[PDB]
Ligand binder design. Sequence first.
Ligand SMILES: Oc1nc(Cl)c(Cl)cc1Cl
Ligand SMILES: Oc1nc(Cl)c(Cl)cc1Cl
Ligand SMILES: Oc1nc(Cl)c(Cl)cc1Cl
Ligand SMILES: Oc1nc(Cl)c(Cl)cc1Cl
Ligand code: NA
Ligand code: NA
Lengths: 116, 116, 116, 116
Amino acid sequence: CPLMVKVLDAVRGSPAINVAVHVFRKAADDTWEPFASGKTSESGELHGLTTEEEFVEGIYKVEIDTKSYWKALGISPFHEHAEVVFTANDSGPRRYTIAALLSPYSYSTTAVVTNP
Amino acid sequence: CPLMVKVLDAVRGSPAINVAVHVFRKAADDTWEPFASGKTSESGELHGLTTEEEFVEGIYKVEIDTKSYWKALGISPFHEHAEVVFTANDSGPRRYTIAALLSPYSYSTTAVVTNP
Amino acid sequence: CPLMVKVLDAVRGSPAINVAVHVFRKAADDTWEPFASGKTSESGELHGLTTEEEFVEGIYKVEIDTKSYWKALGISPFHEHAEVVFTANDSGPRRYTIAALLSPYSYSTTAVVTNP
Amino acid sequence: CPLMVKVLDAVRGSPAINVAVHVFRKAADDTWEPFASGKTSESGELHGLTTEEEFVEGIYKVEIDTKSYWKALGISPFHEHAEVVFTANDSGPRRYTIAALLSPYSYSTTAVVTNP
Ligand SMILES: Oc1nc(Cl)c(Cl)cc1Cl
Ligand SMILES: Oc1nc(Cl)c(Cl)cc1Cl
Ligand SMILES: Oc1nc(Cl)c(Cl)cc1Cl
Ligand SMILES: Oc1nc(Cl)c(Cl)cc1Cl
Ligand code: NA
Ligand code: NA
């Protein structure tokens, strides 16, 4: 698991379950190419997006579909989604956890980067 | 003012209005002495708490009555209050803004310390 | 202004000054069109981006050049930029403040939407 | 583990290791009685503070010693500590995770409450 996403709900005090996440990687022509996608589990975690072999150097975009999450709960939120954009693996392989804390008009994101 | 407090609501995307705020100063016997208090305005801001003459170096505590705020909106929150404890230092810049961003099960706080 | 952007620095406890901000509007073909831009002032604020006449309903993206900000302080940051994507809706209140709080490996953003 | 504390460092993009945490419980005479203490591990987590039997109903204060953490790293931070104050177990036993994200002039805290 070189790439993991974890999402929490600041209104309910709970993991954010069933949040859709789409990952893109910037291509040689400067467009965002689809790279991996999934949804958070009952623990708010999304595991298994990619592998060490496939997760090469690049600029990645992790799109967290916060609007779909809030609307599936019947609430009207402010943001369309949360985008986390970063260069990965430029000094060799690392393990990345992208965490997000969600409210209807606010979110926070942080990264935990470790060296295996 | 040397000290200003600003409170925001992450659920509704609005200032947090009519929130009670109490400021205390640590006394020599390690107890908290009342220092100043008020309620946030329509902009979420509380001005006029103290003066330069009165705001000497020391340890201060800002207590924000977040539980009453959420209950008046019909929401059951997690925290009893939000407390911000810091040292005022004359070497640093002269004006302190204590900002807090509120959700039912979370809050964040940051200090903006500037010189006019 | 109908749209204002404010950026704060969580490491130094200060406004984030001279941060580049680009605003885009989603066009009918799903591409991002340049809409407005500027640099934050000494207060961390960027005023005057647009007018009521120009700021019609639609999807907007605010891109904050956080990577350049940290590099000019001699700090290597995680994110390429911070992006805030939202729908402007005439039914809601009239003035939007997009606030962001920056650290090298995290950021938060909140929307304060008010009526004068 | 009915009570767990997790702490992250937003400057380093890492767990906050070796953070001291003191938990207090409000006594019948309205004072804060020491309840449990410990320090975060290499994963930023603090396990084993208490037991189901001992973690009765009450108002608890979780004090996270952020100043000692930053100073042990040679940095001068703003806050003395972070205090998280909440009523626990008022509707029967629950499991509580208190999470905190730290920067020198800012912190965020959230709670995850689950029913075993
Ligand atoms: O396990 C976890 N990991 C991270 Cl990174 C956060 Cl922010 C929160 C939790 Cl509970
Ligand atoms: O957590 C926070 N986030 C933002 Cl965006 C602001 Cl302006 C202030 C705080 Cl304390
Ligand atoms: O003036 C301010 N405005 C906003 Cl919107 C935030 Cl989040 C924080 C501050 Cl200090
Ligand atoms: O402010 C915060 N932000 C994030 Cl992303 C997590 Cl996981 C936890 C907290 Cl307290
Ligand atoms: Na390289
Ligand atoms: Na009860």
